[PDB]
Scaffold this active site. Sequence first.
Site, mmCIF file in Angstrom:
data_model
loop_
_atom_site.group_PDB
_atom_site.id
_atom_site.type_symbol
_atom_site.label_atom_id
_atom_site.label_comp_id
_atom_site.label_asym_id
_atom_site.label_seq_id
_atom_site.Cartn_x
_atom_site.Cartn_y
_atom_site.Cartn_z
ATOM 1 N NE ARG A 28 -64.775 101.175 -8.885
ATOM 2 C CZ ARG A 28 -65.737 100.481 -9.486
ATOM 3 N NH1 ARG A 28 -66.524 99.658 -8.792
ATOM 4 N NH2 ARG A 28 -65.914 100.615 -10.803
ATOM 5 C CG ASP A 43 -71.092 99.120 -10.880
ATOM 6 O OD1 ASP A 43 -70.682 98.068 -10.346
ATOM 7 O OD2 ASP A 43 -70.338 99.922 -11.471
ATOM 8 C CD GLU A 55 -69.244 91.265 -9.583
ATOM 9 O OE1 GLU A 55 -68.175 91.651 -9.093
ATOM 10 O OE2 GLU A 55 -69.931 91.974 -10.354
ATOM 11 C CG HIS A 95 -67.025 89.464 -12.900
ATOM 12 N ND1 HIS A 95 -67.891 89.897 -13.881
ATOM 13 C CD2 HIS A 95 -66.585 90.580 -12.266
ATOM 14 C CE1 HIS A 95 -67.990 91.214 -13.830
ATOM 15 N NE2 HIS A 95 -67.206 91.654 -12.860
#
Lengths: 332, 332, 332, 332
Positions: B76, B242, B298, B174
Amino acid sequence: SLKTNFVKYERKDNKDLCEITLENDAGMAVKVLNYGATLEKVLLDGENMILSLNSPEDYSKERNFLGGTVGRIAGRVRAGQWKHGNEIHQLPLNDGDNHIHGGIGTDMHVWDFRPSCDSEHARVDLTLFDPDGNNDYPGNLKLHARYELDNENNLHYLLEAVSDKLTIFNPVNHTYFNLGERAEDLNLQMNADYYLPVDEAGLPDRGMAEVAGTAFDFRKTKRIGDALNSDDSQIKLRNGLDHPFILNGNNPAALLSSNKHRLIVKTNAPALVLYAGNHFNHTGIVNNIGQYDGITFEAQCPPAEGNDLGQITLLPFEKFKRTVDWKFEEGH
Amino acid sequence: SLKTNFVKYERKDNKDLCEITLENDAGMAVKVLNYGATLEKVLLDGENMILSLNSPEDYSKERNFLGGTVGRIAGRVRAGQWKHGNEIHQLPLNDGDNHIHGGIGTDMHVWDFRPSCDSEHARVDLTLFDPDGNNDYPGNLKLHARYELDNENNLHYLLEAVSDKLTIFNPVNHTYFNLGERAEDLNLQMNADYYLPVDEAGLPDRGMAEVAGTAFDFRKTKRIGDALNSDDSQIKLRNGLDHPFILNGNNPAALLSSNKHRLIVKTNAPALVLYAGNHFNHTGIVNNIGQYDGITFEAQCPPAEGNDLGQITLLPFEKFKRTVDWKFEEGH
Amino acid sequence: SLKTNFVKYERKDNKDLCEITLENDAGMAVKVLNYGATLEKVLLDGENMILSLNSPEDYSKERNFLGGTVGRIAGRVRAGQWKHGNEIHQLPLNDGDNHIHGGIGTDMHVWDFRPSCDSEHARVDLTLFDPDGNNDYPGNLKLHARYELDNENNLHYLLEAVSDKLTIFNPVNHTYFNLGERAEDLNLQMNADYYLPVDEAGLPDRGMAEVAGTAFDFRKTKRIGDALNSDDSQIKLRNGLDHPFILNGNNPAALLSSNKHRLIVKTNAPALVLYAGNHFNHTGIVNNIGQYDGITFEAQCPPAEGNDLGQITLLPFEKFKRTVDWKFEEGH
Amino acid sequence: SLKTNFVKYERKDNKDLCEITLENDAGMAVKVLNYGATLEKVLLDGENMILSLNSPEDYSKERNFLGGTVGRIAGRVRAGQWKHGNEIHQLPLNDGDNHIHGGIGTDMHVWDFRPSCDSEHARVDLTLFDPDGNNDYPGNLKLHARYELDNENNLHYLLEAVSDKLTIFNPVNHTYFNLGERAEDLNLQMNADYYLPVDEAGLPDRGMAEVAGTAFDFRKTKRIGDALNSDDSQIKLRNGLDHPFILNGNNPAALLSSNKHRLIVKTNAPALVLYAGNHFNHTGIVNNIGQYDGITFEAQCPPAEGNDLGQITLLPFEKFKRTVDWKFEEGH
Ligand SMILES: [Cl-]
Ligand SMILES: [Cl-]
Ligand SMILES: [Cl-]
Ligand SMILES: [Cl-]
Ligand SMILES: [Cl-]
Ligand SMILES: [Cl-]
Ligand SMILES: [Cl-]
Ligand SMILES: [Cl-]
Ligand SMILES: [Mg+2]
Ligand SMILES: [Mg+2]
Ligand SMILES: [Mg+2]
Ligand SMILES: [Mg+2]
Ligand SMILES: [Mg+2]
Ligand SMILES: [Mg+2]
Ligand SMILES: [Mg+2]
Ligand SMILES: [Mg+2]
């Protein structure tokens, strides 16, 4: 093992301030702040070889320079002016009639960082983006600093940068060395036959003068205090050493020594600017440091007498690369 | 012998979709799609070490991310805004009030490819041109991805890029790892002392917090499910892991293990963003994968709290280079 | 000794036309023209391994391609159109509705040159400047070709280029090989599982098709004439081979052989375009060459079906690099 | 030990003029001036191998070229004109109808410098910034010259440059060699089969001509004076040698010899321009040098007949690199 770690201690400019530790198998621990890509401590068997503030938090309370990656230009620029061809660019006058230390320079910014290590080195890479027009300097600039420790007790400093516009760039690492004692009492030998005498404004005004016959002669090992306490007019003018020395090319650039330790300084810079912490006085934020406690070996291109800054001019996309090596060893 | 081959299975965007196989002499076969420069399978003696869709065709039916080279920015960007100097650039708001995953990102494009091999490696090089202004990002961009397999069962991932304009770029591979089992049941050790807690929008809001005393502490080997099923408020907020972890610099970055296999993760990235496939539920196109079956590592610069994206800014003609190494070995 | 020399034979475009000879200690002599950076002859113990014109003077009398460095783009571009983002650039329509071979291409220009040698190689470096807008291609372009001979009878071809503008570039060396015989009679093995079938205009129209079950199957050693004289509709359409083959990545790219000689072809290109000199007929300037006497292995990115030329797009200042190696050895 | 030092002797252009000495362990001392990055002396056991002025001060009193780094273009440009595409740029006409030697060229500027040494070399690196539009040349230019001495009595000259605009650049080191004697009496062998005959204006007008059968034939060892005192029309026209020779690629480029010494010349340039100091006459500032006392081996791209200067064109940001090696050894 060669190893790294860091601890977060504060927030500034919506970023974390961290203290990064590099350690080797030879008794050395190096502490770096991402604030100003600053060399905070160099511990050899627990003994600090450089000047440090009371706490990491102290470094960002005001500009005190020690250990910092000072840019875009370390030192003074006469009238803040850069002439190239028929064009002159004007930098901010933060030093009376002149410009100094990049304005609100890179030693005052929070850099990003990444520690790493392998079988030979423990290191921290730091990066900073400085936008076009900041402090009235042209060009978006990407800076990369690395502090890298090996098992020979050499600390390597690498500073690289690229601009997207024709610009001027001459940064320096502003570490003050004391070898756990006071620089005034230390011996120094330096392979430089010339220095740049300065005027009342602290800038060169007549190019090189021979060190021979002056307080600036460190061609043979000499106690730093002998220069500092001499009647030399240039020493009196600047309240101690505050002078560019032009290296003669023989190795090492400088050798600083006590009875217990020696520091061997090497660099790809043409000059070392020596400043003996002439203004420290055991007051304020820096109350733990007094006059002549430490000495810099600011490895840069020398400050210039005027607006011809060809030596420090970068074309767009030209890679700037400065190296300094500080090797710490046992005394005689 | 180290060898390569590929098969064409479909057409998309007037280009061929192929599945490329890299094989070595040590029991490994790696399958790559030129669609999104995607890591499809990693077979060790016939056993798949990563999450994969039912068929190669499934990858391009919708955006499901797994294995993909996600760019131009993975993760983001707050308010989709990038501030540099006095300029702010606005990226598309495809994540509510924010931007995520490059808009219609590079994991959704068909890359060109070229397999090759030699006595030491079997590899596939992939390239993509992304024009200036695509997804409102500045700069024509050339991306080069390489997957390279050696006889030590190390799979190297190299991702390089150059832009012709000042821009922002922070892509990621990913891939979700499961070691032929379920990530929820696997052990993880990770050399990271800090993570970035996130807000309701999934972005960092306060910089680093210590992993010590939280579900995020993987400094010592711990079952991933212990974190996932804990009462930790950050775990509950994001329905699992996350979260960006900030690496401490010691090797390896992460070690994922079952009783039978271990995966050693190394990278030149400063952070690993760990996502435990929190949304999978054995439905839709991805009906073969359930919640917590796999975990990403990631390897990127971390998502930022705001519009200061200096760390991921590229000057025109500046070379971006990301490396990740995934080494697969036998268990304990 | 490895040695070089050259002789001037003519003038063109106010420049000298020279024939450069590279020789080794293993029976090889290579002749290069600075006109078009052209490979003229490859002599192995006096026997020529490639097609050549009657005299060096013949090469510049008209465009016959053989041996030439053909650019800026070798082969066809559909409608002469290049689309990038929302922009399309139009190239000259010198091939009916399409563009081919760079217009008045680099194989028709006089290159500058410089021979050199050392203990391992004899070489000639050639350079050409092509101005922005020539043949309606964007960007000032600097091209560098090198032919380099070693004592293992390998001839290395290196072609590098840089543009100062976003542009498209996909040149090729257009040497035809015959191993001193006729290509129609030679055996070929090629590590390519796919080819690009073409339409009436000679361009791909449906991406890759399997070579299996067609005249294009050279996965196992096959006489070239078997393909040329087959009833295959694609062979009939193009009057022989005139087709891109997509390499599978295994080594070598191609192996051409007679009873006496073998040629091992390696390249960093993803494709070889094979053209069997389908139009030669022992008439005109090229009266010494007949149909199917030689075969190219044009090492380039493949011609594309349309205006998406991402694979061959160069950013300003991006280095293009093509390598081809032609190794000549003794037969079985 | 390999060692360096310098002495300041004057001021010019608000900069210091210094004489830098490089010394090795094999009897060689090399003297360099930062004025024009000029090779002043090459002393082999006290004997000077090159032409030198009476004093370092003499070099900057007027333009006499010897030893200098002459740029941006050494030698002539026809009508001062450079054509690229449909554009022609006009350089200053300081040579009658033509341009020569960069106008007020780089051999007349004060360069910055930095000596250094290590276990293998003693060197001095010099740099110069030349602004866009100086002498009507396009592009800000950064030049870097290095003179580097090793223990094999090889003096390496490296000259690198980058421009920020499309431009033309073809500098040369203008050292005259005499091996402590007079060049007229020395033997020369040169691996060049062709030279460029010149017109009354001193420029090539017909490309290469064979040296065979002319005064210019140095393929076999020949006394330089045999050429100088011959009835050859080109020798008479230019009052001696003043001619580009095009190298054939075999090593070395040139071998100059007396009974006592030999000089082996190697270069990555395609040509050597030989000028035998045809105008010296033991008068003026250069009163210590007479006609034919020394000979240059100006290693550059050759002067061109007209406005096509493709060979010497640089793209923005393209790295120019010239090397020359001068190895001094004992005679036969
Ligand atoms: Cl200037
Ligand atoms: Cl004090
Ligand atoms: Cl900013
Ligand atoms: Cl589930
Ligand atoms: Cl596009
Ligand atoms: Cl025929
Ligand atoms: Cl032109
Ligand atoms: Cl005389
Ligand atoms: Mg402003
Ligand atoms: Mg005190
Ligand atoms: Mg738009
Ligand atoms: Mg399940
Ligand atoms: Mg036009
Ligand atoms: Mg025939
Ligand atoms: Mg002007
Ligand atoms: Mg005389």
